[PDB]
Design an enzyme around this catalytic site. Sequence first.
Site, short mmCIF file in Angstrom:
data_model
loop_
_atom_site.label_atom_id
_atom_site.label_comp_id
_atom_site.label_asym_id
_atom_site.label_seq_id
_atom_site.Cartn_x
_atom_site.Cartn_y
_atom_site.Cartn_z
N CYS A 33 17.46 34.25 -14.18
CA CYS A 33 17.76 35.67 -14.08
C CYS A 33 18.60 36.00 -12.84
CB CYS A 33 16.45 36.47 -14.08
SG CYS A 33 16.61 38.27 -13.95
N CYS A 36 17.41 39.26 -11.09
CA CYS A 36 16.15 39.04 -10.35
C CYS A 36 16.43 38.36 -9.02
CB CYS A 36 15.15 38.19 -11.15
SG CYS A 36 14.95 38.74 -12.88
#
Length: 111
Positions: A33, A36
């Site tokens: 991700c 993230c």
Amino acid sequence: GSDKIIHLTDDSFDTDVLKADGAILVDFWAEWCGPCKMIAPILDEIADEYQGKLTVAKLNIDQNPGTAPKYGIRGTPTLLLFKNGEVAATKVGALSKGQLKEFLDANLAAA
């Protein structure tokens, strides 16, 4: 990561978040991700800077597959601000420190 961040599990969510005494900002995240990865150091600085006013928490969706569907999360990262057991605000996706600060300052003060 900051040692001030609470790493939540599926089993610990209700106790850690819904029973919290104060505001908890929850980061739904995963290994693969980009976004993230990008808010992580930002969150570390918020944990330091908002100590006493907020607790930053992480829910790793690789390691805890159950909680996210319950809360309508359709992607990562998603930040949920909780207050006395209530979702009080939501922010999906990467953001700047400045954006996260404005979101928190606005939302921590609202009761």
